[PDB]
Symmetry: C5
Subunit: 205 residues, 5 copies
C-alpha cells in the first residue's frame, strides 16, 4: 500500500545496519531459541553431526519504530536482513558454514521489535560414538555473539521446542536441554554470554 | 525499441522491490502451481527425496502497469527478478537451498501482471520407506509465504499437472494431489496460507 | 588504446543491458550452434548425461555500432557479457546450472554484431539405458529463449560440426542432428522457437 | 547507539580498504597465530589433510583511531572485514579455498587496533604417510603475505594454543611447533616473511 | 601511508579496466609461465587429470604509471585484480572452472608493470590411459587469450619451473615442455597465439 512506501522512506534514512542499536546504558536484549527438525547424518569416523534446525531470534531495534497514527493499517513490515542490523550469533563448535534454507527476511512491528526465524542446515563437531547405544550420543550446539559482549548484546533463552522433530527419522530424539552461560575470557575485559542446546539421540534399533 | 527504453526509465523511478504491492484492504493474490518433472534420487537412509520441478507463480503488481497508448508496441517486458518484489514462498520442509536452473527473469504485461516460472532442483525431507512396494512412497512438498499472512498474500493453487513428468525415470509417478490450508500459529492474530503437494511414487517393475 | 577508451565513453551512455535491442517490428535474430566436446559421464540409474560443449551465439545490437572513421583502427572490442544484453537462452531439460568454463566476454564489431562463444559444462535429463547397445542412447539437448517469443527473438541455427569431439573418450559418437522448430505453449499468445541438438552415442568396445 | 553511528560516518570518510595503513617506513606489524581445533580427514592417496582451525590475527590501522572523549560510550566497534584493509595472508600449500565458518567481523578499538579471529576449514597438501606409525605424520601449514614484503607488512607470531583441540578425535595430536621465516625470492630485493605451523599427529589405538 | 592514498585517487580517475592498454603498433605483451605443483587425481574412466599449479603473468599497462618523485616512498602497490585490466587467458581443454587458491591481488610497479601470480586448482581433459606405464601419461595444458589476437595481446613464454613439484606426490613427474604457437582460426584474418605446457607423468613404484 501507499503507506508502506512512505514508511520505507522514513525508516531508511540515517539507518545503518552495521551498528548495533544500543541506547544509553541498555544493551540490546536478544531472545534466542533452537528447534530441532532433523538429524540428517552422523559421521562416526570424523566425529560430526549434520543437523537441520529452526532458530528464533527476536530483539528490539529502537530506530525501527513508528506511530501507527501516521501510517494507518501498517502494523508490520517484511524487511530483508541485509538492510537490518542482526545479531552476529555464531555456532561456536560448527565445522561447516550455515546453509540458510528460508527467505532471508525479518518481520518488524511498529514497536521496532524484530523477528528473524531462519531454518538452517549445519554440521557440528560431536562425539557420536554413543549413537548406537541406549545412552545414545550427546552433542552440544553452542551459540553466542561473535563480537558483542554482555553489556552490548544481552543473549537470553526463550522456551525451547521439540514438537518439530520429524517422526520418520532413523534417529530417535531422546531429549534436548537448554542452558544460558556467561564467562569472562583472559582476552577481553567484558564477559560474553552463550546459549548451549544439548541434544541426545540414538539410532532406532 | 526506443519505447522499451522509455518504459524502463518510468517504471524504475519510485519502484521499491521491498514493498509488497498491496492495495488497501486488498491482499496480493499469488497463483501458484508445481509441475513435477523428475525424481532425481531417493535417500532411504536419511529420508530425503531429490526432485526437479517447475514452479508457476503469477501475481499482479500495480506499480508495474502502463498505458499502451503511450508506449505503442510494448505489450510485455522481461525483467530480472532481482529488480521486482517477488512473493517470499518458502519450501517448509526443504533440507537444501533451491538450485534455480533457468534464467531468473519474469514477464510483465501492461496490467502489471507478473509471471515468474523458474525450473528448480531441490531436496526435501520425506518418509521414502515405501518406495519399493505397490503402495509406494508418499512425499509432501509444502510451500507458503514466510512473513506475509492471509490478509497480505492470498496464495491460490492452480490445477495439478503431471504432464511434464519424464516417462523414462526409474520411478513411476502414481499421482499428485493438492491441498490449500490456512494455519494459525500461536504467535499471531492472522493465519498463514500454505499449499501442499502430495506426490506418490514407486520403483518400476 | 585511446580510441577504444573514447568509444567506451560513447557506447556506455544510455545503454541499458536489460532491454532487448529490437528495432521496430524486426525481431533480434540470434544465431546459435552447439559443438560437443566430451561426454563426461552417464548416470544410468538417474538418467542423466554430463556434457562439456561449445556454444556459438551471434546477434546484432544496433546501439553498439560506430563509425570506424571516427575511431581509426578500432574494428572490434572485447566486452564483458555482464555489461551487455544477451539472449536469455535456456536448456529446457537441464538438471543442473550451466557451469561456464571460459572468460565471460563477447566480441563486438562496428556493425554492432556481437559474438559470445562460451564453453560450458552441464547436466541433462536423458534416457541413457541404450548406452551399451550398438544402437546406443539418444539425448536431446533443447535450447530456446525463456521469455522472448518468435517476433521478439528469432532463433536460427548455424551448421553443426563434430570435429571438436575429443577422440580419446570412452564414448563414441554414432549420430548427430541439429534442428530448429517452432512450437506453441499452453499459455502465451505467441509461438517460441527452439534449436534441438540430438546426439546418439555408445560405449566403445 | 548514537555515538556509534556518528563514529561510523567519521571513520568511513576517505577510508580506503585497498591501502595498507603504513606510516613512514614503519611497516604495519601483523600478529598471527593458529589454534588447531580438528583434523577432519587424511587422504593417504592424494596426500592431503583436512583441518579446522582458529586464526588469531591483529594489527594497527592508524586511520581507524578516535578519541573516547569525543565518543563517550564507544571503546570498540564491530566492523565487517569487507570494509577494512586486511592482511593478504595466503596459505602457501593449500589445495582448496578456505571455508570461513564464523561471522566475517573484526573488532576495532580506539587505538585503531584490529582483531580478526576467523574459524576456518581448509585442505592442505601434506605427506600423511606416517599417520599410522608411532612416529606419526607431520604437516606444515605455511602462511604469509602474498604481495607485501618485510618492510611493508611485518608478520609476527603470537602465542600458539593447543587447548582448543577436540579430545574425541580419532587422531592423536602429538606436537605443534611454530616458526617464523624470511625468504628471498629472486624477483625482489626485500624478503617476504612467512609463519609456519608444523603439527605432528597419528591415529589412535 | 599518505602517498599511497594520494596515488590511488590519481590512478583511479581515468582508469578503465575494460580497455586493453594497447598503443598504436604496440600489442600488450604478456609474459606467461606455469609451475606445476601437484597432480591431485587421475580419472582413467572419464579421461581427466586434476592439477594444482602456479601461473606467472606479467605485462605493462601504461595507465598505471607514476613518477616516484611526486610519490616519494612508493615503488609498488597491491591492487585487487577485479580493479585492473587482466589478460583473458583461458584454459582450452579445461573441463572445470579454475579454483583460485591465493589472494586475488596483483603487484604493480611505478613504470606500469603488473605482476599476477595466482595459485590454481583445475581439472583438464586428457588421455591418462598410460599413467601405469614406463612411458607414462602425457597431458597438454593449452592456454591462450580468448578474445584478443596477436596484434593486440602478444603472448610470450617465460622459462618454467619443476622444482615446485612435491616430492611425496603419488605421481612421479617425468618432464614438462613449453611451446608457443600461432594458430589461424579461419574466421579471423589475424592469428591467435597460445602457450602449451606438455607434462609427462606416471604412478610411482
Ligand atoms: C495481463 O495478464 C493478466 C493475466 O492473464 C490478464 O488477466 C485477466 O483479464 C481478464 C479480462 O481481460 C480477466 O477476466 C475475466 O474477468 C472477470 C472474472 O473476474 C470476468 O468478469 C470476465 O468475464 C468478462 O465477462 C464477460 C461476460 O462473459 C466476458 O464475455 C468478457 O470477456 C469479460 O472480460 C472474464 O471472464 C481475468 O480475471 C484476468 N486474469 C487475472 C489472473 O487477473 C490481464 O488482462 C493482462 N493485461 C492485458 C492488458 O492483457
Ligand atoms: C511488537 O512486538 C512485540 C514483541 O512481540 C510486542 O510485545 C509483546 O506483546 C505481548 C502481548 O501484549 C506481551 O505479553 C509481551 O510482553 C510483549 N513482548 C515484548 C518483547 O515486549 C509489542 O507489543 C508489539 N507492538 C505492537 C504494536 O503490538
Ligand atoms: C586497544 O587494543 C590494543 C591491543 O590489545 C591494546 O594494546 C596493548 O596494550 C596492552 C596493555 O593494555 C599491552 O600489554 C600490549 O602489549 C599492547 N599490544 C599492542 C600490540 O599494542 C590497547 O590497550 C587498546 N587501546 C585502548 C585505547 O584500550
Ligand atoms: C560485423 O560482423 C558481422 C558478422 O560477421 C559481419 O557481417 C555480415 O556480413 C558478412 C559478409 O560481409 C556475412 O558473412 C555475415 O553473415 C553477415 N552477418 C550478419 C548476421 O549480418 C560484418 O561484416 C561485420 N561488420 C563489419 C563492418 O565488418
Ligand atoms: C617494473 O618491473 C619490471 C619487471 O620486473 C622491471 O623490469 C625489467 O627491468 C629489469 C631491470 O630492472 C631488466 O633486467 C628486465 O630485462 C626488464 N624486464 C621487463 C619485464 O621489462 C622494471 O625495472 C620495473 N620498473 C621500475 C620503475 O623499476
Ligand atoms: C571470539 N571469542 C571472544 C574473543 C576472544 O576470545 C579473543 C579476543 C581477542 C584476542 C584473542 C581472543 C569473543 C566471544 C566469542 C569467543 C569465541 C572463542 O574465542 C572461540 C574461539 C575459537 C573457537 C571457538 C570459540
Ligand atoms: C514462520 N512461521 C510463521 C510465523 C511464526 O512462526 C512466528 C512469528 C513470530 C514469532 C514467533 C513465531 C509464519 C509462516 C511460516 C511459519 C513457519 C513455521 O514456524 C515453521 C518453521 C520451521 C519449519 C516449518 C515450519
Ligand atoms: C518458459 N516456457 C515459455 C513461456 C511459458 O511457458 C509461459 C509464459 C507465461 C506464463 C505461462 C507459461 C517460453 C519458452 C520456454 C517454455 C518452457 C516450458 O514451459 C518448460 C517448462 C519447464 C521445463 C522445461 C520447459
Ligand atoms: C608470490 N611469491 C613472491 C613473489 C614472487 O615469487 C615473484 C614476484 C615477481 C616476479 C617473480 C616472482 C611473494 C611471496 C610469495 C611467493 C610465492 C611462491 O612463489 C609460491 C608460489 C606458488 C606456490 C607456493 C609458493
Ligand atoms: C575463441 N576461439 C577463437 C575465436 C574463434 O574460434 C571464433 C571467432 C569468431 C567466430 C567463430 C569462431 C579465439 C581464440 C580461442 C579460440 C577457442 C577455440 O575455438 C576453442 C573453442 C572451444 C573449446 C576449445 C577451443
Ligand atoms: O526495508 C526497510 N523497510 C521497509 C520494508 C518494506 C516495507 F513494506 C516497508 C518498510 F518500511 N528498511 C531497511 C532499513 C530500515 C528499514
Ligand atoms: O526492469 C524493469 N523494467 C523493464 C525491463 C526490461 C524492459 F525491456 C523494459 C522495462 F520496462 N523494472 C525494474 C524495476 C521496475 C521495472
Ligand atoms: O529486454 C527485454 N528482455 C530481456 C531480459 C533479459 C535478457 F537476457 C534478454 C531479454 F530480452 N525485454 C524488453 C521488453 C520486455 C522484455
Ligand atoms: O564495455 C563496453 N565497451 C568497450 C569495451 C572495451 C573496449 F576496448 C571498448 C569498449 F567500447 N560497453 C558496455 C556497454 C556498452 C559498451
Ligand atoms: O564500518 C565501519 N565502522 C563502524 C562499524 C560499526 C559501528 F557500530 C561503528 C562503526 F564506526 N567502518 C568501515 C570502514 C571504516 C570503518
Ligand atoms: O586500487 C588501485 N590502486 C592502488 C592500490 C593500492 C595502493 F596502495 C595504492 C593504489 F593506488 N587501482 C584500481 C584502479 C587503478 C589502480
Amino acid at each position: 500500500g501507499e503507506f508502506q512506501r512512505k514508511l520505507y522512506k522514513e525508516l531508511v534514512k540515517n539507518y545503518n545496519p552495521d551498528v548495533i542499536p544500543t541506547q544509553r546504558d541498555r544493551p540490546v536484549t536478544v531472545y534466542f531459541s533452537l528447534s530441532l527438525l532433523q538429524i540428517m547424518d552422523v559421521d562416526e569416523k570424523n566425529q560430526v553431526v549434520d543437523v537441520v534446525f529452526w532458530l528464533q531470534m527476536s530483539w528490539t531495534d529502537h530506530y525501527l519504530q513508528w506511530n501507527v497514527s501516521e501510517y494507518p493499517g501498517v502494523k508490520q513490515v517484511s524487511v530483508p536482513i541485509s538492510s537490518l542490523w542482526v545479531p552476529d550469533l555464531a555456532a561456536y563448535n560448527a565445522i561447516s558454514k550455515p546453509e540458510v534454507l528460508t527467505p532471508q527476511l525479518a518481520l518488524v512491528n511498529s514497536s521496532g521489535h524484530v523477528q528473524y526465524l531462519p531454518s538452517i542446515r549445519q554440521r557440528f563437531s560431536c562425539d557420536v560414538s554413543g549413537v548406537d547405544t541406549e545412552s545414545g550420543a550427546t552433542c552440544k550446539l553452542k551459540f553466542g555473539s561473535w563480537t558483542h559482549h554482555s553489556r552490548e548484546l544481552d543473549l537470553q533463552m526463550q522456551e525451547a521446542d521439540i514438537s518439530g522433530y520429524i517422526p520418520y527419522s532413523r534417529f530417535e530424539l531422546v531429549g534436548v536441554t537448554q542452558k544460558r552461560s556467561e564467562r569472562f575470557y583472559e582476552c577481553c575485559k567484558e564477559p560474553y554470554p552463550d546459549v548451549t542446546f544439548t541434544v541426545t539421540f540414538r539410532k532406532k534399533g
